[PDB]
Ligand binder design. Structure first.
Ligand SMILES: Cc1ccc(CN(C)c2cc(C)nc3ncnn23)cc1
Length: 127
């Protein structure tokens, strides 16, 4: 029933880059999903205590959220775009694992994920 530590957003010994793909992931992909009407549930780690979801972190062992992704991108935590893309996919997947088809939160995830997919479809070539 307790919350875990959040995912890491800082690790000074992890090597870092700011690729044109990673910039796109911040300026286009994150910005698009962040501003969306359905962004709010996904803008920070799931608070299992406040939300009374005592089994959340029994089920979800790789938590992820856009608050975490936003800090990662802004703090240049990644080496490549695929790390970040995986973070987004992990976020959507967790929601689908924990919840049921047609739940409100699932329809929100789905709307954000459709947009995610449309933006990632135009990820620029690595320059
Ligand atoms: C429509 C809706 C439904 C549930 C919540 C609670 N909350 C912030 C989240 C957020 C996320 C991302 N997954 C969740 N799985 C169950 N609750 N929950 C917020 C909004």
């Amino acid at each position: 029933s307790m919350n875990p530590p959040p995912p890491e957003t800082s690790n000074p010994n992890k090597p870092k880059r700011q690729t044109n793909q990673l910039q796109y992931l911040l300026r286009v992909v994150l910005k698009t999903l962040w501003k969306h009407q359905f962004a709010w549930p996904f803008q920070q780690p799931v608070d299992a205590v406040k939300l009374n979801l005592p089994d959340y972190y029994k089920i979800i062992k790789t938590p992820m959220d856009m608050g975490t992704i936003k800090k990662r991108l802004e703090n240049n935590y990644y080496w490549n775009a695929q790390e970040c893309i995986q973070d987004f996919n992990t976020m959507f997947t967790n929601c689908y694992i924990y919840n049921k088809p047609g739940d409100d939160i699932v329809l929100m995830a789905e709307a954000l994920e459709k947009l995610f997919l449309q933006k990632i479809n135009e990820l620029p070539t690595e320059e």
